[PDB]
Amino acid sequence: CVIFPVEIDVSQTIIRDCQVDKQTRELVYINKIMNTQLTKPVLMMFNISGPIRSVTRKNNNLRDRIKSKVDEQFDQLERDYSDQMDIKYFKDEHYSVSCQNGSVLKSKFAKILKSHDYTDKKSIEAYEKYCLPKLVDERNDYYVAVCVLKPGFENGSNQVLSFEYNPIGNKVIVPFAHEINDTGLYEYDVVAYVDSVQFDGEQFEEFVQSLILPSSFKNSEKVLYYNEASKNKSMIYKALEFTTESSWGKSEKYNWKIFCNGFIYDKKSKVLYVKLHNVTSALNKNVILNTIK
């Protein structure tokens, strides 16, 4: 049964944020860029609820271990009938992470002792207009993690990064935010797994609702929206459904339900399963949650 799948194509984004102890959570982040042979210093940033107390590299076996635990949680919704078969640096050689107090990054930004210099203004200039303005706000807190994946990062496995940090105020900021673009629309391709956070349908209805799903190329396709509240569950997601006919005998129909995207919450476990696979939305924001107070 085929061994020719997943390769230089598999690179959406995987994020896992778990509470490791009383006041320390751990962030695991794997993006497309980290999985390619960089030839120059690459820059990337996001938001963290608190300050980073340590940055390390993990084994790629993690990328699938996470994406599984989640993809499965959503797959229980679907009904796919497709044919099957039989001031706080953290230097290192390859990378270089820096964690500053949101607002501080704006005021000094230019300072690239993190060595994203040779990109000069013609390259940094970009990030202050399309990214930076979306990482700092009226809540001058919201620390910004700044990484500079320097070449060599590809060598060996362990492309996954892990941020150990101390949440401030009981807040958790799952980094979905993008790079403000001229067009006005953003395409999401990410799976996240955060735990020890309290539900919040208000912000999940707002997100899921503004999602434009991919097409199955069938006039009869309708995109329904859901808001179930099972036993130990609560799902807010949009799926695409269309009925299908038999391929031989009896006139038995088959009601599909695919491309499900949204948020699933385990009332008991206190875990948040997120899935935004190739969906478009005019909403480009991070998701803020509260740690079980």
């Binding site: 049964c1 085929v2 061994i3 020719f4 009938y81 497709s82 044919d83 099957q84 078969m85 039989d86 299908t244 038999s246 391929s247 031989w248 005998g249 088959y254």
Partner: protein, 243 residues
Amino acid sequence: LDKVYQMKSKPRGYCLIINNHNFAKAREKVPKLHSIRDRNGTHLDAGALTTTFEELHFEIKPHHDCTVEQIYEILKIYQLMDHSNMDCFICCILSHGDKGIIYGTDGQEAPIYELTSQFTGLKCPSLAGKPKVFFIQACQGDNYQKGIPVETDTRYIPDEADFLLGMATVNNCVSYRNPAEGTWYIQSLCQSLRERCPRGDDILTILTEVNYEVSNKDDKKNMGKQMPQPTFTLRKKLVFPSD
């Protein structure tokens, strides 16, 4: 003048349908087979072949999820039996596979040769001279068949005679099974059999059409194409009538 296999016997013959569904034991033991899923839908073809070979007066004999070892025994049984009052013997295997093999619930292969040779003229004197049919729905490789554009449409007999062997696919290529409706081959083998049997057409005529259907069936996804391919050492037209 002519020739045709006898099929008068009221209880035509047995129909060991071996339907494999759960390959969990395999997902654990055999390492390579850990990223393997279960054959969801097989039930539609087991309940398809059972219906078909029922109107054709065949005394079906279903078998759960069996492992290689059990399978060998299951065959070693209907081999020591007497098949005189029977004018036909059928055997259907449904499960995963690869290069001329058919995995079992366990995860270890089981060469087709060692399964179909179990019913030679020698091994089963009772079945000598009577057609022994085999339908094998299973992968046979990891490769996908491309699809080119047609732009149309008293004595002694050999020990391995009378043998129809329907292969869900050519060698080296994959077979297709659909969770909602069923597998292409098994389904066509029935929708075409259960229909052409009234009008009295031999199985060899039926399998031709079947290769037609599955050839059109297309894997909308990975541009896939299936292509059955039977083999026979039969001596006379095989045909079974009903009511």
